[PDB]
Structures are given as structure tokens and as C-alpha cells.
Amino acid sequence: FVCNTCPEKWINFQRKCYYFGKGTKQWVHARYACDDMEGQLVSIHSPEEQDFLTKHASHTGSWIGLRNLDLKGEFIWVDGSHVDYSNWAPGEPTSRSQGEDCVMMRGSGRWNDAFCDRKLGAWVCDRLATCTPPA
Secondary structure, three states: OOOOEOOOOOEEEOOEEEEEEEEEEOHHHHHHHHHHOOOEEOOOOOHHHHHHHHHHOOOOOEEEEEEEOHHHOOEEEOOOOEOOOOOEOOOOOOOOOOOOOEEEEOOOOOEEEEOOOOOEEEEEEEEEOEOOOOO
């Protein structure tokens, strides 16, 4: 059993599928775009997953599945997972909004807090990879 099979217009990495979305859309507005295309906004859990994303990343920044609910201070991924791997930029995560503050990836791959209503050029979708029959 291996997971290399990817859907149309999606790139494989380990056991995940990544869609490098393009188009002027705000955070929650790109979050729902992932859903319709049978996935979710990218959950970054390893330095390897990050460097792959840094490789295919956009020059003008990309949206990622990280959102704040300060009422805790901390951040949560869209898949319900907490923050393991952290690629914060200098000063980050200092909420550039109090509470609800979404996270975006730069060209450098470095995360920074951004206003929930920022109209960004790109976003990164992700789903698990479709499995392989036995050898």
C-alpha cells in the first residue's frame, strides 16, 4: 500500500495532494473553494511539507488553513489539529488583529498574521492521496 495517486491538477507529496490555487479571494472565501474541490486549506505539520510548499509557493503570498480565536491566544488548523510545526516570520504570531486572524504564507514560506478580509492572489488546498492496491 502506497499513496502516490493524485487528482487532476493536484501535486503529490508523501501521502498528501496539494492544489496551488490562484485568484483574488479572502481567507474564508478561499477556504470554501477548497471544500467544493473535495479538500481543505493546507495544514502544515512538518519542515519537509513546508519546504515543498515554499518550492511551489506564490511570489505575492498564499493563504493557508491557519486561523486564530485569540480568546485562547493560540492558533488552530482547519482539520481540527493544533500547532506542531511553526514557520513564523520576525515578530509573529503577534495578532495583526486581536482575535480572528488568519495566517498566510509568503514567497519565503514564512507565516505571518493577516486580516481575515485580505484579498490574496493565491491559496493552497490539500487532501490525502488515493491509495494503491497490494504488490
